[PDB]
């Protein structure tokens, strides 16, 4: 009944309505707009919100989602990869989920930069890539772990812990165990970098802005939001937010289109009953 099938459609309702609204008019104010003809959205119809944008000339917002703290990007473009290891080295990124599959970014017609798998040059920043540890996370879903060195003349080195799922296709929601598991695992990576700063007394653990984990799929609406509304109902702080203001808030900081999915937006109602927690505001 607070699950059943009458709550759900209400539900839908409610966020069908604000994924309406949000639709981006041109040269919208409430988004972040291309500069001087330089491309900035991967996909035109999935902007960046520009009151959380992170940086002027990324297509990436400040996500916070009752305490939950993150950073949603779309995949950078090349032309952006200077810009986006800038943005991860500043935020002191205590982790990157690249929830992009192997066969998306090998499809040269994706335009898809590899990244976080290979050496590279960005400009002035120079990027190590090293490949730890793969874990299993149940149904067959696989992760790559990476550690990216960035460097920079004059800047401090900054290394970054990597979670790369390998084979969550897109358009596709992963079951709720598989997103618990992930979750889990993203988190606890964050936990350990954390920790690892704490530990050397570094100011930037007490900046809000900053340590924020950075996820990321192809669009970074879709696979993205599923993986945050997930860690957000794995914080412990954020007891009595609903599925309803979760994805409201999701919404209203990046775009419309978060939680791309039914079948998205199902798992997260899974989670939720699994937790007694509510669907829709009272
Ligand atoms: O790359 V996603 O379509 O799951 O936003």
């Not at 997103?179 to 690892?196: G, I």
Request: aromatic fraction near 4%; charge should be positive; charged fraction near 20%.
């Amino acid at each position: 009944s607070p699950y059943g099938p009458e709550a759900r459609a209400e539900l839908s309702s409610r966020l069908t309505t604000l994924r309406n609204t949000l639709a981006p008019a041109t040269n919208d104010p409430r988004y972040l707009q291309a500069c001087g003809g330089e491309k900035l959205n991967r996909f035109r119809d999935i902007q960046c919100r520009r009151q959380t944008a992170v940086r002027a000339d990324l297509n990436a917002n400040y996500i916070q989602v009752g305490n939950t703290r993150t950073i949603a990007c779309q995949y950078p473009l090349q032309s952006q990869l200077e810009s986006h290891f800038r943005m991860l080295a500043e935020n002191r990124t205590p982790v990157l989920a690249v929830l992009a599959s192997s066969s998306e970014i090998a499809n040269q017609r994706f335009g898809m930069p590899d990244y976080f798998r290979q050496s590279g040059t960005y400009g002035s920043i120079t990027v190590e890539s090293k490949m730890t540890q793969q874990v299993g996370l149940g149904d067959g879903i696989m992760a790559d772990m990476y550690t990216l060195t960035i460097r920079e003349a004059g800047q401090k080195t900054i290394s970054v812990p990597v979670v790369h799922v390998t084979n969550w296709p897109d358009q596709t929601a992963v079951s709720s165990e598989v997103t618990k598991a992930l979750a889990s695992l993203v988190d606890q990576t964050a936990e350990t970098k954390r920790n690892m700063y704490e530990s050397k007394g570094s100011s930037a653990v007490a900046d809000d802005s900053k340590l924020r984990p950075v996820i990321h799929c192809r669009a970074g609406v879709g696979r993205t939001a599923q993986l945050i509304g997930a860690m957000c109902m794995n914080d412990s702080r954020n007891s009595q937010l609903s599925v309803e203001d979760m994805v409201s808030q999701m919404r209203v900081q990046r775009n419309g289109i978060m939680v791309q999915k039914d079948e998205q937006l199902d798992v997260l109602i899974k989670l939720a009953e699994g937790q007694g927690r509510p669907l829709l505001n009272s």
